[PDB]
């Protein structure tokens, strides 16, 4: 009983002491003579329109030409970014949707929402129409994020404080990761697709191994719920998007905080976070209807992406790193370059 | 300058846009109420006369009502309560009958305080359904309201107790400049609740139209 709690306290203090001992210097002081990137001027290129309600999520295709968006209108429009054309317009069953996923192969799409059911739609059929290929069920809470591992697997994170790994064919729940104490609000997949980090509402993030079940590392330091998580292209770091006007950068191989990106002029929460192709920049979406481009190596502002009349809800960067698409509650997506 | 396949793709995109516009205009001509309550309350009966979210479509006097009942959604209300911003009205069902500690009325007013004084719901109106009148009568004749409301000081008649409860439930609204609360007692008389809902929705629609034109 109590002895277990005391042993847990000793384990925690040992962990924090070891982490403190492993700390010798800060990244900010390490990169003190690394020239600034200068002002980053951003201009809208395309202004994809056609939604009739708040946009809640989006995802870029593998070719970095096609994207998919969802809104409370009840639609899953698929846009061709180059010519602002619509390829498909999938009508949903329940309009309370807050998640999208585009398969890396490009054949399927996935959509979650408040109905606790993850629908998987097939795009390429001989009938020339999109039909619901599968309907995964089993979560007892609202779905928050879903990502495609392969054409036959999916990873979901919902509000029942658990994450799931589903096999599409059998429709089962092949793995279930648990250990959080609050709603899980975001999820990101490593480039090698063997590990993934989930950020919960208990002001924490965890690193899960897809093959196994337990969480190898737990990262804390935020003072509020985390609404966004994004990996670093190197695969040895990630960035969070918590609600207390602060985005922090965590490193996998030291279990330690590295840097925080905060300004006394910013008080609103962060909804989306995404790195760049190389990792020099970090784009974050705030509730000020703006988007901030933080110099990820030295924690300085490098530009502003104003132009939206409402909260920025989804943010994405193309695979080739040629453009950045932001979708807001104004029922508008914009393609900056 | 476009090719043939590009022209055909543009044609398909225009057709898709037309279909989207028609679907949106069709879906804008309807009323969307959000149902709420605490405990058992009277949600079952309320949806009777009229695994996550549950919808219910019904037509009255040539008007389409949808009634989103969050119900079985045990989660953080703060995370998804903003999805319902813009609903026409919030129906709030409470039962006067319980008032027996084991305190439920206290929880009901706590939930009402948390819902009414919310940043998102600063414009949407609230319809209040105080139900279980017969059980309230059967209970009042042996026990007074002093157990739940000590401060209370009045006659044990039914009318005074009902008025006091209504006044306290209407006293928790702080922004009494943009939002109005309508109160009913259902009584399960057959066409007594849907008519009240229709009247409240008509008043809300009138106010919204006046605000949109620019003279309200």
């Amino acid at each position: 009983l109590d002895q277990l709690r005391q042993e847990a306290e000793q384990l925690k203090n040992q962990i924090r002491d070891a982490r403190k001992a492993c700390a010798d210097a800060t990244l900010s002081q390490i990169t003190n003579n690394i020239d600034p990137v200068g002002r980053i001027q951003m201009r809208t290129r395309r202004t994809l329109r056609g939604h009739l309600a708040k946009i809640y999520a989006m995802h870029w295709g593998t070719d970095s030409r096609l994207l998919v968006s969802a809104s409370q209108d009840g639609k899953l429009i698929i846009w061709d970014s180059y010519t602002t054309n619509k390829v498909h317009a999938i009508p949903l069953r329940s309009s309370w949707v807050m998640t999208c996923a585009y398969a890396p192969s490009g054949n399927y799409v996935a959509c979650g929402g408040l109905d606790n059911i993850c629908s998987i739609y097939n795009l390429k059929t001989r009938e020339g129409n999109v039909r619901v290929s599968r309907e995964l069920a089993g979560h007892t809470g609202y779905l928050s994020c879903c990502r495609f591992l392969d054409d036959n697997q999916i990873v979901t994170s919902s509000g029942d404080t658990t994450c799931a790994l589903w096999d599409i064919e059998t429709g089962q729940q092949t793995t279930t990761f648990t250990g959080h104490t609050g709603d899980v609000m975001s999820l990101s997949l490593a480039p090698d697709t063997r590990l993934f980090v989930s950020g919960a509402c208990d002001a924490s993030a965890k690193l899960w191994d897809v093959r196994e079940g337990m969480c190898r590392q737990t990262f804390t330091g935020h003072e509020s719920d985390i609404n966004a998580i994004c990996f670093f292209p190197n695969g040895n770091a990630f960035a969070t998007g918590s609600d207390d006007a602060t985005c922090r950068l965590f490193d996998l191989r030291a279990d330690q905080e590295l840097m925080t990106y905060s300004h006394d002029n910013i008080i609103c929460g962060i909804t989306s976070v995404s790195f760049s192709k190389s990792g020099r920049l970090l784009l974050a979406g705030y509730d000020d209807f703006n988007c901030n481009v933080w110099d990820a190596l030295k924690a300085d502002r490098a530009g502003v992406l104003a132009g939206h009349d409402n909260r920025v809800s989804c943010l994405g960067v193309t695979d080739d790193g040629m453009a950045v698409a932001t979708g807001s509650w104004d029922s508008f997506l914009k393609i900056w370059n | 300058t476009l090719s043939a396949e590009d022209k055909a793709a543009v044609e398909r995109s225009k057709m898709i846009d037309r279909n989207l516009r028609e679907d949106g205009e069709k879906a804008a001509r309807e009323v969307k109420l959000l149902l709420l309550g605490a405990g058992e309350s009277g949600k079952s009966t309320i949806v009777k006369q009229m695994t996550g979210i549950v919808e219910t479509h019904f037509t009255f006097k040539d008007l389409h009502f949808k009634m989103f009942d969050v119900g079985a959604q045990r989660s953080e209300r703060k995370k998804w309560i903003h999805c319902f911003e813009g609903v026409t009205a919030i129906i709030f069902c409470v039962a006067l009958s319980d008032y027996d500690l084991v305190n439920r009325m206290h929880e009901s007013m706590k939930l009402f305080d948390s819902i009414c004084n919310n940043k998102w719901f600063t414009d949407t109106s609230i319809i209040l359904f105080l139900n279980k009148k017969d059980l309230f009568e059967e209970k009042i004749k042996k026990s007074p309201l002093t157990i739940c409301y000590p401060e209370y000081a009045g006659s044990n008649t039914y009318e005074e107790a009902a008025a006091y409860i209504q006044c306290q439930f209407e006293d928790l609204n702080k922004r009494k400049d943009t939002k109005e609360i309508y109160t009913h007692f259902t009584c399960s008389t057959d066409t007594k609740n849907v008519q009240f809902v229709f009247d409240a929705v008509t008043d809300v629609i009138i106010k919204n139209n006046l605000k949109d034109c620019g003279l309200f």
Partner: single-chain antibody
Amino acid sequence: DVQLVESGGGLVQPGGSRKLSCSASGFAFSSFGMHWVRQAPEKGLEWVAYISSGSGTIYYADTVKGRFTISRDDPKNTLFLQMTSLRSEDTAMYYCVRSIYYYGSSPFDFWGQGTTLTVSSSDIVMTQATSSVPVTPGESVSISCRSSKSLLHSNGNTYLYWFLQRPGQSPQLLIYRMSNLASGVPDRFSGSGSGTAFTLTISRLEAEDVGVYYCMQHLEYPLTFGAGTKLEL
């Protein structure tokens, strides 16, 4: 179960006004463009008419303006072409081709069965040069379709298609846009080249590949077809 069945064939006197019909079952007919393509008794294919989805774009061939009228009926899932003032040239077998146009789509996917019609009494020329060549199973072959104008639009994609017609059956799509293998086609087939120089290659030959191979352009809409190269033995 994708089926396109045509009807309305039979002998017609000169000056007749017979009408042909096409019934489609097994796909969303409302969102597919439809092509009527004729084939002479022994010559190659020849585009005739095209109707778009939504009936917003109608295109006719060179010889049939004012005499042929195409039309579709979506709820009944039918597509009929009314032919007036018939001559002796129109003695041919008519087909029924579907084509859906969007980014990454494969037009001219499925072909009908064809109905015969007998009547007893500018454009991009695409020469296929060679007409026939004897081959043996287990060999690699190539077919050239030298064109007149370069089929290289500013978008960066070449509009050219390779079809194969087996002896007695209906032509089926093999290659679209000279680089993408059509669905269901085995890996062995391939296509390559540049503007005004296109080659389709087959790695190993065996039965069921003997037939006639055709090439078609799709830049503008007097859609032309190649002469047709015969592979036999």
